[PDB]
Amino acid sequence: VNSFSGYLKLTDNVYIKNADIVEEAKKVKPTVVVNAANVYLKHGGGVAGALNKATNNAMQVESDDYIATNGPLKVGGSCVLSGHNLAKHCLHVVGPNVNKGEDIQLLKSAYENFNQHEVLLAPLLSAGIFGADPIHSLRVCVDTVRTNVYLAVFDKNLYDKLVSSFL
Numbered sequence: 001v002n003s004f005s006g007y008l009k010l011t012d013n014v015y016i017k018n019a020d021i022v023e024e025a026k027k028v029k030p031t032v033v034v035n036a037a038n039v040y041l042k043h044g045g046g047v048a049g050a051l052n053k054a055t056n057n058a059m060q061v062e063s064d065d066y067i068a069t070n071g072p073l074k075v076g077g078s079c080v081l082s083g084h085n086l087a088k089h090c091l092h093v094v095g096p097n098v099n100k101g102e103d104i105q106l107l108k109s110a111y112e113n114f115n116q117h118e119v120l121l122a123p124l125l126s127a128g129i130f131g132a133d134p135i136h137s138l139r140v141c142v143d144t145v146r147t148n149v150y151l152a153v154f155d156k157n158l159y160d161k162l163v164s165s166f167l
């Protein structure tokens with residue numbers, strides 16, 4: 001039993017809700033919140049911009065030190081950093097950004113990072129400003145993640161479409 005509330009159950013381990021991931025994280029304070037990161041951990045917009053703003057830019061400060069030490073992530077890769085005031089940990093995961101021409105096949109690799117964590121609050125990878133089809137992202141999530149994932153979909157209209165079209 002966990003403290004996630006109001007989610008629709010899609011499969012044995014995947015759950016979904018129309019919610020702002022920032023507000024969800026502040027309420028639940030989950031062990032792991034997933035950020036929709038880029039390889040440079042530059043948290044400018046989308047989910048990443050929103051999470052970073054909620055940390056008063058502490059996420060960006062920590063991220064800049066991480067990059068200075070380790071260099072960029074790989075597309076499809078991840079790193080674990082602090083969750084600051086939002087969660088215990090933030091798993092920064094890089095899905096392919098279609099608006100940059102990156103290979104959508106890497107979306108499965110991106111979701112595989114979730115399997116290293118028993119429970120996660122997460123967005124749909126590569127959706128929104130990353131330019132992929134969110135229905136596809138949800139399908140890859142369900143077919144790749146085996147741990148317990150709580151998906152927050154900010155757009156209510158998109159949420160209804162994802163539920164109604166879910167196979």
Ligand SMILES: OC[C@]12C[C@H](CN1c1ncnc3[nH]ccc13)C2
Nearest residue numbers: 021047123124127128152153154
């Ligand atoms: O998960 C659906 C997605 C579409 C991309 C961005 N949307 C979000 N989902 C949850 N909290 C969010 N905050 C800002 C955007 C946002 C991922």
